[PDB]
């Protein structure tokens, strides 16, 4: 019985650079320990179908790339949600079929306004739907 799920928030108070892996350092849930809070990457052990999702608090423009791959990560989608002198919360989500060794993570862009704090959380979660 493979119970694999994780929810981690970003509390790190450091701006994001283009192409940087977005680290969610504070773990709420991490059953099977397939998510690494040090990197911000999930690494598949048990092949199969996973749902990945996140909610990002922001103060201006934000685009995030959802990434997959073993040795070279490639972007699946990009989610952009803009805000002009206001506060926003945005979300993205994806069902992915995953092979063993493949990692999934969120990657920063040009648009890197992201908040991680008490009262304005940014969370990254994922879970197994069905194994192969």
């Amino acid at each position: 019985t493979q119970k694999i799920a994780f929810s981690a928030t970003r509390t790190i108070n450091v701006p994001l650079r283009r192409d940087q892996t977005i680290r969610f350092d504070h773990v709420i849930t991490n059953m099977n320990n397939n998510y690494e809070p040090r990197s911000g990457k999930f690494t598949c052990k048990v092949p199969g179908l996973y749902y990945f999702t996140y909610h990002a608090s922001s103060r201006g423009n934000l685009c995030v790339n959802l990434m997959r791959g073993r040795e070279r990560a490639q972007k699946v989608v990009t989610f952009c949600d803009y805000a002009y002198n206001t506060f926003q919360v945005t979300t993205g989500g994806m069902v992915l079929k995953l092979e063993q060794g493949e990692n999934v993570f969120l990657q920063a862009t040009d648009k890197n306004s992201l908040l991680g704090m008490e009262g304005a959380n940014s969370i990254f979660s994922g879970f197994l739907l069905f194994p192969d």
Binding site: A5, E118, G119
Partner: protein, 129 residues
């Protein structure tokens, strides 16, 4: 049942009171009756890993807080002026029997969606233990 699922909705045009628990009075699906519309709380019958997610419509500032057993787990705020947006949040939690989960607002409490924009809270058991 040995499962747990709900999608409940907030059918009223008056927004929550500031700094209060958000009641979702209307059920779309709730077969185990795990979410209680009279109290506004989900209470765990079947222990294990749960996914919780909401989508909340608002035409003024809105912060939604998720509470587990008296403890604030996550907060997400959206700011808007007159026009309609959707505030979204969610989390995976491993729950024990009798544990309560609910949503709340702070001083930013607006959930008045325009005509055709609604507010929904959903939760489901994924891995029983």
């Amino acid at each position: 049942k040995f499962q747990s699922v709900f999608t409940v909705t907030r059918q009223t045009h008056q927004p929550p009171a500031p700094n209060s628990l958000i009641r979702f009075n209307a059920v779309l699906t709730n077969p185990q009756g795990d979410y209680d519309t009279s109290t506004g709380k989900f209470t765990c019958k079947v222990p294990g890993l749960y996914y919780f997610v909401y989508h909340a419509s608002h035409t003024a500032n809105l912060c939604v807080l998720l509470y587990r057993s008296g403890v604030k787990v996550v907060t997400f705020c959206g700011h808007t002026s007159k026009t309609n947006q959707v505030n979204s949040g969610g989390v995976l939690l491993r729950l024990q029997v009798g544990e309560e989960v609910w949503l709340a607002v702070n001083d930013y409490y607006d959930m008045v969606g325009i005509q055709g924009s609604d507010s929904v809270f959903s939760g489901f058991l994924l891995f029983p233990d």
